[PDB]
Amino acid sequence: LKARSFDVTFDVGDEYEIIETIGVVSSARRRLTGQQVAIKKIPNAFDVVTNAKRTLRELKILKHFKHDNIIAIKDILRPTVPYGEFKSVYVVLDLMESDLHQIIHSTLEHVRYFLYQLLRGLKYMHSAQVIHRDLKPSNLLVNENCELKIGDFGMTEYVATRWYRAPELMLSLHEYTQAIDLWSVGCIFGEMLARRQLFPGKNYVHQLQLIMMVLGTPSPAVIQAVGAERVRAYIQSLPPRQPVPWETVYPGADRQALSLLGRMLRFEPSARISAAAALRHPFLAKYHDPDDEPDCAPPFDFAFDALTRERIKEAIVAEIEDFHA
Numbered sequence: 213l214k215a216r217s218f219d220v221t222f223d224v225g226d227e228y229e230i231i232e233t234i235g236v237v238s239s240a241r242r243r244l245t246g247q248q249v250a251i252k253k254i255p256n257a258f259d260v261v262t263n264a265k266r267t268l269r270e271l272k273i274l275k276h277f278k279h280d281n282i283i284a285i286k287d288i289l290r291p292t293v294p295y296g297e298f299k300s301v302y303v304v305l306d307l308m309e310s311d312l313h314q315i316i317h318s319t320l321e322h323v324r325y326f327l328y329q330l331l332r333g334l335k336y337m338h339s340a341q342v343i344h345r346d347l348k349p350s351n352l353l354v355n356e357n358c359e360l361k362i363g364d365f366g367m368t369e370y371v372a373t374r375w376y377r378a379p380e381l382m383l384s385l386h387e388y389t390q391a392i393d394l395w396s397v398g399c400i401f402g403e404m405l406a407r408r409q410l411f412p413g414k415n416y417v418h419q420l421q422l423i424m425m426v427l428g429t430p431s432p433a434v435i436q437a438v439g440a441e442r443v444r445a446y447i448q449s450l451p452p453r454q455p456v457p458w459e460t461v462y463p464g465a466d467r468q469a470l471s472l473l474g475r476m477l478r479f480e481p482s483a484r485i486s487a488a489a490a491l492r493h494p495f496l497a498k499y500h501d502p503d504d505e506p507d508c509a510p511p512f513d514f515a516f517d518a519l520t521r522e523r524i525k526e527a528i529v530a531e532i533e534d535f536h537a
Contacts, residue, residue: 214292222253222302225289239307248307249286254300264524266367267301268516271531273365274303276340276512280504281333283308283353283361288535301528309355311363312400316349318407320466321498322358326404327472328491328499329360330397335487338390339507342366347396348376349403375411376400379423380481383416385438391484398476405465405473427477428455434479468495 214223219233228240228249237252257267274285287304312326330352337344344351345366353361376399378392379385402410410426413419429452438444458470465473472495478484491505516527 214289222300223292224251224302225292227287227289228304246286250305250307252303252305254302256299257301258299258525265516265519268524268528270365271301271303271528273342273512274305275531275535276342276508277336279333279336279506281329281360281362282336283363285535288532290532290536295529298525298529301532306361308353308361310353311350312352312354312360313348313350315354316400316403320469323401323404323469324495325358325499326352326354326360327397327401328496330362330400331394331487331491332505333360333362334393334397335491335505336508337362338393338487340510340512342512343390344393344396345381346374346377347393347400348374349400352400371415375409375413375419378481379420379479383420383443385440385443385479386481387439389481391481391486394476394485394487394490395478397490398473401469401473401476402462405462405469424450424453426455426461427479429453430479437480437482468493471495 214225215229216223220236222236222238224231224240227244228242228246228251231238231240233239234250236255237250239248240251241248254267257263271288274283277284283305285303286306289302289304291298291300291302293299334344343366344362344364346364347362351363353363374382376396378388378395380388381392399410411419411422413422429450430447431452435444435447438447456474458474459467462470462473472490472493475485475493476490488505491500516524520527
């Protein structure tokens with residue numbers, strides 16, 4: 213009931229074909245009239261520890277979420293093998309032409325529609341006690357339209373680049389809350405507004421300093437709420453440069469977006485706004501529709517979150533069955 217091959221070789225199941233690869237991902241058309249869907253195949257994923265349990269979570273995570281602004285599964289095909297060398301899985305997702313990463317660089321009506329979908333999808337996520345933990349414009353699926361879907365999920369080295377990550381995540385100022393995905397939204401917010409990247413740190417050494425200018429130096433209770441000790445020492449030893457001059461920071465912005473920016477970018481997760489609270493912002497007055505902001509009815513169960521072994525290869529077969537009952 214499935215057919216080969218290229219490129220590269222993968223067996224689709226024939227409900228969809230053509231089969232052109234957008235990137236491993238392909239775009240296909242369901243024979244049933246279900247139009248254009250995106251198919252993602254997983255190479256390996258049984259190849260080791262980690263990458264096994266990672267795709268158990270992702271599989272269970274896409275399933276648990278039904279939201280307009282969060283990617284989910286159209287279908288999931290038994291990568292047909294009768295457990296003899298079952299080496300891979302195919303998840304079917306809806307086809308998104310692009311992502312926010314492509315078009316950001318370098319409109320106030322266009323952003324408010326964008327961010328509204330960002331935050332609504334953000335709230336549904338947090339209702340299930342699940343965090344993206346990394347939010348980049350590359351993770352925001354966008355076609356035009358301008359409908360938005362949140363890509364990937366929560367999951368070393370580094371020298372790597374997260375300029376959208378919260379100062380509590382890296383620098384570990386203190387432990388965090390669901391408000392960290394909002395700092396990312398605030399950073400993306402700026403980039404569309406400012407036309408430029410907000411915090412292009414060479415590293416945490418440069419990043420914090422680059423972060424330092426806009427939000428200014430923290431001498432409220434923010435310090436001593438920090439895990440510190442050196443960080444609080446560094447904060448106080450640093451000159452208390454006087455914040456927050458947002459109106460001066462953005463000339464091309466209305467007081468409204470400037471106000472949402474201010475509450476979104478804040479040192480302390482305690483004080484920082486939430487997804488549900490940020491939706492209430494007057495910035496959405498054109499778009500604000502409380503009906504379109506659902507919460508997950510149950511919480512997301514992490515149960516299996518050693519732990520374990522090819523049982524996970526076997527646990528993934530509970531689903532693909534569970535999907536088809």
